[PDB]
Design a protein around this ligand. Structure first.
Ligand code: A1ESD
Ligand code: CLR
Ligand code: CLR
Lengths: 228, 283, 128, 338, 57
């Protein structure tokens, strides 16, 4: 009868509230990257025909669910829409210079998509030891792919990361500046790109994500608490 | 007492504040009740504060008659006592909701990822209930403090005034009430200053406008409430021997405190709501 | 039906020039951002350049910047790529692609697995 | 040879175009102009269904016209009773990225799938009184976009791997595979007699499939961009497709071409879902802008508007008796309109 | 190497689409009009029902 139906509905609604707590307390991340990007290795650094993989890890008692696209076709304009409410997109790009323009175009599409236009991107410029080896070697020239590098000079306010030959710093900061230009040239402060120089061996990658999420959540709290 | 033009200006400004504050506090309640996506914890605190401010403004006409029109308080003594109790309870509830809102803003800014777990919306309704319970418990002595008195040498119909009772003045209840009231200035002011200073430190490390509006909030709170409690203390002191010269100071201070007291209820919706983009679009 | 037909381009000596044209049918040509993509022998598809709906915004890949220029004619529903100072590495099949949806700023049109809104391509060869 | 076959395909395309142009003796507008407009269709929100934490991606009415299942990407299927708004079931999904849900015509099962590339069949009438995953149909190499029961033992699904599949639920293996699309298959509509189904597949083309033979009978073009939604006309001799080019289109199977185009210069956003009313006079289309439009399916006029969603309208559905239309949106609310 | 087959697959397929028995568009338009005319009064959304028979009231 109607009383039993209402009782069952209320029993369901209790469980729904219990699940709402967990759903709200957890942060969801979308891990994007190309085949050459070492994202597959970054996943293995999160030590706590399927079409999606989930790795759930914990930083300072905060739970992150990071989602890696599995068996999907290369056309992504439709399933990417499923991720318009994740807290962040971790975009991993390999520094090898050449696939850099491809990664730049991918980042541009992600940045300017209508359904991803409020999602912040944590940009992992992965494989920086390889970048250093390639730059020092001198055999590969960035100017052959990015002619503007022929006149780019390191900013005076750039952190040096002690122990880097100036050529490595110039190259890495030019590569960072490409993505930062893409991110700042379009949209507005509705979302922010957080560039990082990382290696797949880095043990602090997780921490970086945490440090960025605190900022991302902060930016929403300023709105949620009538502060802006 | 006072020059007639002074109280004419007081009542004019008070009527203007009445319309402005009624509009703001009604808008807050309507927006929060209609829109389900706006029923967040800050908006629950702000709905409680809007109710408190609306009640203060609804009590305002009686207070303004008590101050300006000077029609003898032939109304019920229960009416005087109860309306003073309502005004005081709403004042304390507004102050405590401001404090709670600052404490919840300090979290979610200095601990953005801790607040997602520690802050529970189910407990926010309990917090509002506790705020209101404390306000009622603290305004309870109003029924012992206030009453309808008269000039001893005249008929009890042409000089009936709703005021603190001479018994309370003589028994010392006035001073203890003054200090209990001052608690609701010192605790909120210190809490707001400390927590918003820490928020400003973090954000400074848009953020400029956030810090500016926090400074505005603290400045408006101090402006509206320091005269209130200072005037209450002066009014208590004016009944001691040799305090004749400070009676006029107390009178003027309490007049300005009346104006600022109702300005506070008029301005709270502006300080806490219109600064939000979501609220502005919701309107 | 949505169809893109590219013409021009072929064998050319290094340092030469070639004007590739693409005629578009089956859709409102002026509502879509247009792109030039290419596939060199033994490599994947590579984005070359893009031009917006009105042509006010243009972009090129670094390897061709300063040599190729993209243009569009909406009255004729045509896209042009004028390629100057041809290099041997430009040997490739050139495809004209268009943004999957109108009025958008993003494109997802370099995919190998049969992106629907690009043509069959035209071969451009640079050799001695 | 590649070039020879390409030339042959182009010549056959010209032949088909000429044949369907010869069949185009008159237009639908020139034939329907004498019918009286439908008037202004004013519809109100009778119910609002709350309980989904995240955006709703799909909903489907039960055959009884009372119970309806919705899927949210928070990882839940909710079976609601629309009359009372009571939640009858809340099924937690193993993969939260669900993009489609289906209600068995018998009401005994529901289905759902998404980026996991698997169609999960859930039994609603277990003796123990608790819902369980009856089956997990695997074999697609891309996300499931749509699924629809033919029967308690057969379900047809469309995937982002460009193929559709007819499954035998008991054995859990693809009885048939439908191939021929080049883009992701976004939606499929099952025919009233269940012997055919149409599919729209992100290549600006729709295709008609015979379930038993497993071959593409007809291919319809005319859209300029991806087809996100497809719906059969109630008699099963026509269907409507909505696309990202911000227009809906009506196709007739027997005339084999496009009859009507529903679009307005003030609409520059894609269509996410389409549905026909009981008699087929009204075509309801959800849009990327947060409100749905009701079109006079015969005269191609916008008869009404359903506004009330704060975000993208992701799913649409009309009851089998036509008494109400449910719209689900990315704001996580389903609204019943009447 | 398989692409040559795909083109073939396409070509032959187009043939089975060219050989179907199409009908004049006027017939189809008239059929749709006839269906809508016949079923108009049975459509609650097209013809709003009295509030008593509406199950959502
Ligand atoms: C004339 N009345 C209207 N006014 C405005 C007053 O200020 C007064 C007369 C006065 C007028 C002009 C000049 C000098 C003195 C002075 C100030 C005090 N007081 C109150 O009534 C207090 C009673 C009270 C509540 N807790 C206290 C703690 C310590 C002292 C008192 C109180 N409560 C309010 O005021 C309400 C609750 C309505 N907000 C009467
Ligand atoms: C007794 C008088 C003087 C004051 C009592 C305080 C009352 C009015 C306060 C205390 C808690 C408050 C409620 C807290 C939570 C909600 C839920 C929200 O969806 C609508 C507002 C509503 C319902 C608030 C309305 C005002 C409220 C009921
Ligand atoms: C009337 C008084 C109490 C208002 C308090 C203002 C508070 C809310 C804000 C406004 C601007 C803020 C300051 C802005 C910038 C800095 C520099 C930083 O390196 C240390 C913190 C410090 C010094 C902030 C402290 C808090 C601050 C003073």
């Amino acid at each position: 009868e109607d009383k039993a139906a209402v009782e069952r509905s209320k029993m369901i609604e209790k469980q729904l509230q219990k699940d709402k707590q967990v759903y709200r307390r957890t942060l969801r991340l979308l891990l994007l990257g190309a085949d050459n990007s070492g994202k597959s290795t970054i996943v293995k650094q999160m030590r706590i025909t399927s079409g999606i993989f989930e790795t759930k890890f914990q930083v300072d008692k905060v739970n992150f669910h990071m989602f890696d696209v599995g068996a999907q076709r290369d056309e992504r304009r439709k399933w990417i829409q499923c991720f318009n409410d994740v807290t962040a997109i971790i975009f991993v790009v390999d520094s090898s210079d050449n696939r850099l323009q491809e990664a730049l175009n991918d980042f541009k599409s992600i940045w300017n998509n209508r359904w991803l236009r409020t999602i912040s991107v944590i940009l992992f410029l992965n494989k920086q030891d390889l970048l250093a080896e390639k730059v020092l070697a001198g055999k590969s020239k960035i100017e052959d792919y990015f002619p503007e590098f022929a006149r780019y000079t390191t900013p005076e306010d750039a952190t040096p990361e002690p122990g880097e030959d100036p050529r490595v710093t110039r190259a890495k900061y030019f590569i960072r500046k490409e993505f930062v230009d893409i991110s700042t040239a379009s949209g507005d402060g509705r979302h922010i790109c957080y560039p990082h120089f990382t290696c797949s061996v880095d043990t602090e990658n997780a921490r970086r994500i945490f440090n960025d999420c605190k900022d991302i959540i902060l930016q929403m709290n300023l709105r949620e608490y009538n502060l802006v | 007492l006072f020059p007639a033009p002074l109280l004419a200006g007081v009542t004019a400004t008070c009527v203007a504040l009445f319309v402005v504050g009624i509009a703001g506090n009604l808008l807050t309640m309507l927006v929060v009740s209609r829109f389900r996506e706006l029923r967040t914890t800050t908006n629950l605190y702000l709905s409680s504060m809007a109710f408190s401010d609306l009640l203060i403004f609804l009590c305002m006409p009686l207070d303004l008659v008590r101050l300006w029109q000077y029609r003898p308080w032939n109304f019920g003594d229960l009416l005087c006592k109860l309306f003073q109790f309502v005004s005081e309870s709403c004042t304390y509830a507004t102050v405590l909701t401001i404090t709670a809102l600052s404490v919840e803003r300090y979290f979610a800014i200095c601990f953005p990822l801790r607040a997602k777990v520690v802050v529970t919306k189910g407990r926010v309704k309990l917090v509002i209930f506790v705020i209101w319970a404390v306000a009622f418990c603290s305004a309870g002595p109003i029924f012992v403090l206030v009453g309808v008195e008269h000039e001893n040498g005249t008929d009890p119909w042409d000089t009936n005034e709703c005021r603190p009772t001479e018994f309370a003045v003589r028994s010392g209840l006035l001073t203890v009430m003054v200090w209990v009231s001052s608690i609701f200035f010192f605790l909120p002011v210190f809490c707001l200053t400390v927590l918003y200073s820490l928020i400003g430190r973090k954000l400074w490390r848009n953020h400029k406008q956030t810090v500016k509006m926090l400074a505005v909030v603290v400045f408006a709170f101090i402006l509206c409430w320091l005269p209130f409690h200072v005037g209450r203390y002066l009014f208590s002191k004016s009944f001691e021997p040799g305090s004749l010269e400070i009676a006029q100071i107390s009178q003027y201070c309490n007049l300005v405190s009346f104006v600022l007291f109702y300005l506070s209820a008029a301005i709270n919706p502006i300080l806490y709501n219109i600064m939000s983009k979501k609220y502005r679009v919701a309107v | 039906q949505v169809q893109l037909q590219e013409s021009g381009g072929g064998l050319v000596q290094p340092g030469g020039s070639l004007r590739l044209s693409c005629a578009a049918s089956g859709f409102t040509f002026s509502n879509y951002k247009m792109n030039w993509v290419r596939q060199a022998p033994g490599k994947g598809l590579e984005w070359v350049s893009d031009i917006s709906q009105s042509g006010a915004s243009i972009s090129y890949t670094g390897s061709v910047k300063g040599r190729f220029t993209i243009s569009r004619d909406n009255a004729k529903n045509t896209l042009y790529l004028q390629m100057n100072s041809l290099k041997p590495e430009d040997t490739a099949v050139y495809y004209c692609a268009r943004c999957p949806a109108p009025f958008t700023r993003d494109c997802f049109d370099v995919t190998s697995t049969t992106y629907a809104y690009r043509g069959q391509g035209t071969q451009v060869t640079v050799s001695s | 040879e590649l070039d020879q076959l390409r030339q042959e395909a182009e010549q056959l395309k010209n032949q088909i175009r000429d044949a369907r142009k010869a069949c185009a003796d008159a237009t639908l507008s020139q034939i329907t102009n004498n019918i009286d407009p439908v008037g202004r269709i004013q519809m109100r929100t009778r119910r609002t269904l709350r309980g989904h934490l995240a955006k709703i991606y799909a909903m489907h009415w039960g055959t009884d016209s009372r119970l309806l299942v919705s899927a949210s990407q928070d990882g839940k299927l909710i079976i609601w009773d629309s009359y009372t708004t009571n939640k009858v079931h809340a099924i937690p999904l193993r993969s939260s990225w669900v993009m489609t849900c289906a209600y068995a015509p018998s009401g005994n099962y529901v289905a759902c799938g998404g980026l996991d590339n698997i169609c999960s069949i859930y039994n609603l009438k277990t003796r123990e009184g608790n819902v369980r995953v009856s089956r997990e149909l695997a074999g697609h190499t891309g996300y499931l976009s749509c699924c629809r029961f033919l029967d308690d033992n057969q379900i047809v699904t469309s995937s982002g791997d460009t193929t559709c599949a007819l499954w035998d639920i008991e054995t859990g293996q693809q009885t048939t595979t439908f191939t021929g699309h080049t883009g992701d298959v976004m939606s499929l509509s099952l025919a009233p007699d269940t012997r055919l189904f149409v599919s729209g597949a992100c290549d600006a083309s729709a295709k008609l499939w015979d379930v038993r033979e497993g071959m593409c009978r007809q291919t319809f073009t005319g859209h300029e961009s991806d087809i996100n939604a497809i719906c059969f006309f109630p008699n099963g001799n026509a269907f409507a497709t909505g696309s990202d080019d911000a227009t809906c289109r009506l196709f007739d199977l027997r005339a084999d071409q496009e009859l009507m185009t529903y679009s307005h210069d003030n609409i520059i956003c894609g269509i996410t879902s389409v549905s026909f009313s009981k008699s087929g006079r009204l075509l309801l289309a959800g849009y990327d802008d947060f409100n749905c439009n009701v079109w006079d399916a015969l005269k191609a006029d916008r008869a009404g508007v359903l506004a009330g969603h704060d975000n993208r309208v992701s799913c649409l559905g009309v009851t089998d008796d036509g008494m109400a239309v449910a719209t689900g949106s990315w704001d996580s609310f389903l609204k019943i309109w009447n | 190497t398989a692409s040559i087959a795909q083109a073939r697959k396409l070509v032959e397929q187009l043939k089975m689409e060219a050989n179907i028995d199409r009908i004049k568009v006027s017939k189809a338009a008239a059929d749709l009009m006839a269906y809508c005319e016949a079923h108009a009064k049975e459509d609650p959304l097209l013809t709003p029902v009295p509030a008593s028979e509406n199950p959502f009231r």
